């Protein structure tokens, strides 16, 4: 099968956030509460939702759809998306999601066409560039690459979106919903279930759980486009992973003291 | 069946049930409970027959002194109900009596009208067939 239930339990993909931060509409994916303070999930629901999303993304990638991976979150998520893009040639937006990346696609298409033209001009090279103008062109290349390096490949609106956190990507999921594009996400007890189509009840704070699930989706894509897989349909000795640096791991949401009353009074 | 919370009901039997049903529909709630009266039991029987509810179930205390009726709404797979709105006609104070000639047709026949003529509550179509009318309780569509 896809994964092992004890493996999910060990990667802690069945722990959400503190009970304080939760959307009541996500009560379906949480079993009746208990002395746990971090909103444990239902493992069968996790596996079922993951299998459904896997099947859909596999179908899209086999039928040659264009999927876009979006993480503009912690540096680990950024590097994870970059590695997944290296593994499979899917489009990605690791930097900030630009306003209207999908609903205003014409202007960003103009920008990426300009980026491609500048890139080929620089590659063709010329002695007229000298030093100053060459440096300015290189800096422009660097900026449009940092902000459009994953979008340059596509020429048309993508057929599917994969979001690491719908709460953080509220703009991206809103654009996907207004354009009627499928969007899958790793909901983490604080997300509105209506916006996401293929909900995957999961963790979003654990750098091991997010890595495992993101690599599972990438494994679906890579199997559909036919390379050897990475995590899916694999034993423990190859599924095992490490915990990034910098007793047990602490998925506790803290720092409530930085939420003061809005400036008021007269 | 065992309960934990106290159960109360309004003095007006038609609009109590209508408020419960409308609030449950708007809040997507499925199961609700209320105090049981025979008018409410008959009206829920005709709602179940017409297919606006899944089930209604009456229960009695161990001492046979109190009765409560609990019913569930009929939601589809995508979770949108079959009831679209409820409006009560024969409110307390102003009671509405209409003969057969003026028996109303709710939403061009899409909805139903609850009429308690002489044989308990009765749908608009069967009241028209029987050619007799009476008190008009509520509009449900």
């Amino acid at each position: 099968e896809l994964v092992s239930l004890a493996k999910l339990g060990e990667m802690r993909t069945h722990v959400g956030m503190v009970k304080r931060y939760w959307n009541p509409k996500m009560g379906f994916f949480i079993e009746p509460e208990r002395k746990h303070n971090n909103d444990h999930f239902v493992l069968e629901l996790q596996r079922q939702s993951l299998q459904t999303a896997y099947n859909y993304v596999k179908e899209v990638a086999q039928n040659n759809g264009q999927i876009l991976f979006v993480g503009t979150k912690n540096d680990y998520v950024k590097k994870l998306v970059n590695n997944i893009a290296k593994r499979v040639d899917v489009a990605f937006i690791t930097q900030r999601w630009l306003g209207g990346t999908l609903t205003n696609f014409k202007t960003l298409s103009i920008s990426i066409n300009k980026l491609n033209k500048l890139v080929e001009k620089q590659a063709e090279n010329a002695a007229d560039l000298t030093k100053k103008e060459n440096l300015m062109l290189s800096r422009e290349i660097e900026r449009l690459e940092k902000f459009f390096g994953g979008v340059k490949s596509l020429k048309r609106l993508p057929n599917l979106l994969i979001v690491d956190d719908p709460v953080y990507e509220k703009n991206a999921v809103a654009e996907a919903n207004i354009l009627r594009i499928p969007v899958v996400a790793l909901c983490n007890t604080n997300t509105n279930p209506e916006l996401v189509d293929f909900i995957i009840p999961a963790n979003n704070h654990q750098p091991q759980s997010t890595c495992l699930l993101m690599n599972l989706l990438a494994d679906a894509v890579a199997e559909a486009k036919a390379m050897p897989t990475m995590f899916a349909y694999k034993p423990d000795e190859e599924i095992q992973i490490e915990i990034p640096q910098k007793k047990q791991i602490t998925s506790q949401r803290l720092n409530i003291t930085r939420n003061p009353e809005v400036l008021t009074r007269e | 069946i065992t309960t934990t919370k106290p159960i109360k009901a309004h003095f007006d039997p038609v609009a109590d049930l209508l408020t419960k049903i409308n609030n449950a529909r708007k809040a997507k709630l499925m199961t609700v409970t209320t105090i049981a009266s025979k008018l409410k039991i008959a009206i829920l029987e005709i709602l179940v027959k017409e297919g606006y509810l899944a089930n209604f179930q009456v229960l009695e205390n161990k001492s046979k002194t109190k009765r409560i009726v609990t019913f569930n709404l009929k939601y589809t797979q995508r979770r949108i109900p079959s009831i679209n709105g409820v409006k009560q006609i024969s409110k307390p104070g102003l009671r509405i009596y209409r003969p057969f000639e003026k028996l109303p047709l709710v939403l061009n026949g899409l909805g139903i009208a609850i009429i308690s003529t002489s044989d308990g509550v009765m749908t608009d179509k069967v009241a028209r067939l029987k050619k007799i009318g009476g008190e008009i309780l509520a509009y449900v569509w």
């Binding site: 379906f28 459904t52 859909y56 179908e59 899209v60 039928n63 759809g65 057929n159 499928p182 279930p193 209506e194 996401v196 189509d197 293929f198 909900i199 | 029987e45 179940v48 509810l53 899944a54 089930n55 209604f56 179930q57 939601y75 589809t76 797979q77 995508r78 979770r79």
Partner: peptide, 22 residues
Amino acid sequence: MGNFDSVQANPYRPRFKRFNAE
């Protein structure tokens, strides 16, 4: 009356089923 306990506890079910070409 009408009790069958159908159980329809599948909210927020996926709408799209399978991608296809014209």
